[PDB]
Amino acid sequence: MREVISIHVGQAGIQIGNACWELFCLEHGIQPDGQMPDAFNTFFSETGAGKHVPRCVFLDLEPTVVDEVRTGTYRHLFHPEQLISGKEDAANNFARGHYTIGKEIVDLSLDRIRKLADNCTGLQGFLMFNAVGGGTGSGLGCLLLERLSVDYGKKSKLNFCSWPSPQVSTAVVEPYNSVLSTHSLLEHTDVAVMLDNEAIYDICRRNLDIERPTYTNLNRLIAQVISSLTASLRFDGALNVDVTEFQTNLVPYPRIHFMLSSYAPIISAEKAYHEQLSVAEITNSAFEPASMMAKCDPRHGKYMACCLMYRGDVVPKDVNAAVATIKTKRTIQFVDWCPTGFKCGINYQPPTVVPGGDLAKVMRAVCMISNSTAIAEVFSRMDHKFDLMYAKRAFVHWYVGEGMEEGEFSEAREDLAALEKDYEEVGI
Amino acid sequence: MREIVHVQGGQCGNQIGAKFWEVISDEHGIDPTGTYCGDSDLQLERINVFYNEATGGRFVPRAILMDLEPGTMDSVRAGPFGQLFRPDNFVFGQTGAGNNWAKGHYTEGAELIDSVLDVVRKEAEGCDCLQGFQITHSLGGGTGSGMGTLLISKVREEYPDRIMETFSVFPSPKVSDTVVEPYNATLSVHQLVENADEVQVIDNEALYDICFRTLKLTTPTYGDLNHLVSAAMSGVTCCLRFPGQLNSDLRKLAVNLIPFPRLHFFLIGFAPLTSRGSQQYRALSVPELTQQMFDAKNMMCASDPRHGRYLTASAMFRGRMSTKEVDEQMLNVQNKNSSYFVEWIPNNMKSSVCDIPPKGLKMSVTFVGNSTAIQEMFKRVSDQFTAMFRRKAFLHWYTGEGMDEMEFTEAESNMNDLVSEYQQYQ
Amino acid sequence: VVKRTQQGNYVPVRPDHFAGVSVALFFAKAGHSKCAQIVPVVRQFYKTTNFSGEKAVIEIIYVSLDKDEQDFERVRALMPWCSVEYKSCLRKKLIERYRVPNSTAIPLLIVIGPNGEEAGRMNFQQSDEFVLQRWDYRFNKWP
C-alpha cells in the first residue's frame, strides 16, 4: 500500500542502518528469523507465509561490512539479493565511486529498486543513509540518487548525512569529498538531515553520563530519532504527519533543505530517578543548544521553521502550554518574515527500549527537525577547509587521474558560494 | 576475492620474509605443515588474501622467492616453516649479483626475468581479480636493490591498475654494511620513485636502538629484529583480513597519505614495546599508546622527527577500544603539538580501528607517517653519493658491464630533486 | 547409541526430538585440515539458523572416522550438537551403509529424509563455500 523504500550506501550507512533495522524488528515483534509470534506495512513486505522481509537495500563496493551481516545473527532476515557487495573498496575518492567502479553496481541496484517499488502504487519516498566524507558514501550515493530522480519523477527523498565534524575529521580528503558531494546533493534530495559525530560523543559524555561508549552507542541514539520520525506512518496518533508533508513544512525555497535534529529525553537509568519527565521540561531541553545533534551554536542563528513530533502519552494542551512560552522567549530567536514557525504532531505509542541499551524507559519523548540560518556556520567553515587545501592543488592528481576534470572543483565551489550567500540574504 | 602477492628479493628480503610468514601463520593459527587448527571463523573468512588451498586442506602462501645465488633460498627451506612454501615458487640464480646494481639490473638479471615473471603471473591469474603486491628488499645489496627494482618495473607495466608496497631497508649514518652503499641506493631510489606507490623505510640503527633500550636485549640477532619488522608489516595489513569499525586498506591509506605522487616514503612505528621486566608495570590504555607512538626513539627510521613537521600520518589501532578515546586523542596531539604538524592540511592525522588485537596482546597500534624529516636522510645519501663520485671511486666494477656514466648523473639530479620538495613544503 | 553433550556428562537422546524438524548426519574426522576448516563454519551456521527463532528447524548427528577414543572425546568436548557412541557398531554400519570411504570425501553432510534414506548430499571439496544454505529445511521436515 503506502511505504518507504530505504537505501543504505557506504559503511556509515550500513552500520547505522544495521542498528536502525534491529530497532524496527522489535518494534513490531518481528523475530530475527523474520516471522511473528496494520503495523508492519510501511517498512516490510510479506513473503509466502508468516514472513516479513524488509524494505531495504545494502550497497557497498567492499564485501567486508555487508558480508559480515550475511553471516551475523540477521541471516534470513534479509533477502540475499538486495545485499550487494562489489570487489574492491571505493577508497575515499569521489571520482572512483562516481566514474570507474561505481558504474557496475548502479546497473544492478536500480533493478532491485524497481523490483521493490513495483508492488503497490503511492510510494511515500526514499530514505537513503550515507556519510559525506567517505568515498562510496558520496560517489555511489550521487550516481544512485541522480538516476533515481530522472527515473522516478515526483517522490520525496530523505537523506540522513553523517556530516564531517567541525573539529575531528578521521580522514584527510574530507574537505575534497564533502564539497563535491554537495554540488551533486542540492538538486537531487528533498530533505537532507545533517548529523554529526562528536556531538553524540558530547551528548553521551554529558546527558547519558557513560564514560566509554563506542559506535554501537552512537547508532542506538540515531536509531531512536528515525523511529520517532516515522512514528506517524506506523501507528495512529491524536495528530499525525507524513513524510511527503515535511518538504511542505520546512523548505521555503527549493535549494534550502539542510535541517538539524534534536531528541529528548536522553537520560541514564541511574539518573532517571531525579527527573519526572513532564511536557513542560522536555520541550525546554529540546531547544537547549547543548542537546542538538549537529554541533552548531544557534545563538547566531535565526530560526525559520520547526517540526516537533511528540511521542507517547502526551495530551495536546500542555504541548500548547509549552509552545506558547517557547515562542515568547527571546533566547530562541525567530526570523521576522516567518511569524508562524511550528508544526507539532503527536503519536500515541511511547518509544521502545532496546535490551542491552543505555536508555531508561521513558513515558514521553520529543524529536525535533528544524531549519535554521546557523548552517551558514557549517558551510562557511567548510569552504575555508577547501580553498586553504586547494591553495596549491593538494591531492589533485588522485582526482584528476581517476577520471574527474580539473576545474570541476571550481564550479562546485561557485555552487557552494551561492548557498553561502542566500543564507546571509535570508537572515536580514 | 582480493589477493596480495608476496615477492621476496635479495638476501635480506628472503630472511625478513621467512619471519613474516611465521607471524601471519600463527596469527591465523596454521600448523607449519600447512594444515589448520584454531577453530574460528573470524581468522579464516579472509584467508584467500594470502593463501591457496592445495588438495590436502593445506595452505601454500602466495609467496615467490627470488635470489641470484642459491645460498639463502635453501636457508629458508631448511629452517622454520620451510615445509610451507612451494618448491615451484623458488627461482634460482646460479651466479650471484655480488652487490653490483649493474648486474642486478642489466646484464646478469635480464636472463632470469624470463622465469620470475612466469611464476608471478601463474599465481596472478589463478584467482578472480588481484588487489596488489608487496615486496621485501634491502636497498644496500645487489640482488635486492637492482634485481628487485627490475621486477618492480616489469610487473607494473603488465598490471598498471594494481598497487605495490615495498618494505625497504636503507643505509645507516655511521656504521656501514656493503661499502658500495650509496651507489646501490641512489640508483634504486630514482627507479623506485617512478614505479612504486608506497615504500616503508626501515633503518638498522633506529632498529638497533629500539632493541637496546625498549626491549632491553644486550645481544640482538637477526631473528629477533625481523620479528619486530614482521609485526609492523603484519599490522599495516590487518584490516584486509579482519573486520572493524573504521576499516582501512593499502589503497585506502595510499590515497589518504600522499598529497603529490613523487613523495611517498613513509615512516613506521609500533606500540606497545615492552620488555619482560616492565610488562607487568604498564597499564595498557589508549592514552599512552598515542604517547608511545609519537616518540622520537620509537620510529624505525634513524631520523629525529622533531626537526621536520609531519605532513600526513595514519594510525591502525587494533583491538576493542572505545572510539572517542580513539579520535579525541589524535585531535589532542594535533592541537597540543601544533608545531610538529603542517598548517596547510586540516586534520593531518588518520585513524583505523581493526577489531582483532594481535595474538596474546590486547591493545596495539601501528603508526605509518609521511614526514618531512626525511629531508635530512635523503640529503645524507645525496652527499655520500657526491663524496664517492668526484674521485670516481669504485666505478669500474659497474661501468664494465654495460653501465653508463650518464645514469649516475641523472640519478643524483633525480634524487636531489626529491629533497627539493620536502624542504619546499613547510 | 546417540548421545547429547550436557553440563557434566553424556545422555542418551530422546527419539521424539528428531521429529517435526530436519536431520543431517555429518561425516568427519579430527586432524584433517578440511575438517578443521568446516567444523566451526557448520557450528556458526547451526547456532544462527536454530537460535534465530524460538524452536529448532535443523539438527546434526556427528559421525566420526577418528582412530582414537582420546581424539573422539576431544572433539566431542567442544562440538555443540549430537554425537554417536564410539563402541556402538552403528557407526561402522552407517559408514558402510552411506558410502564414505574412510582425502576428497570428508567432510560430508548427508541430509536424511524420514525413511532413513537420504534427502541430500553436500560436499566442501570444491571452490565454493557458500553451500551450507543451499539445503532447504522446508521441503524436508520429518513428520
Binding site: 522489535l26 523475530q31 509470534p37 545473527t73 559506535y215 | 600463527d26 596454521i30 577489531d355 | -
Partner: peptide, 22 residues
Amino acid sequence: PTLPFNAQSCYRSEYVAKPLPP
C-alpha cells in the same frame, strides 16, 4: 603452532537476537 583465540568483536558482543517486546 597456536593456542585458542579469545578476542571478540564489539558487533558480535552486543547485537545478538534479543527477545521481542510482547
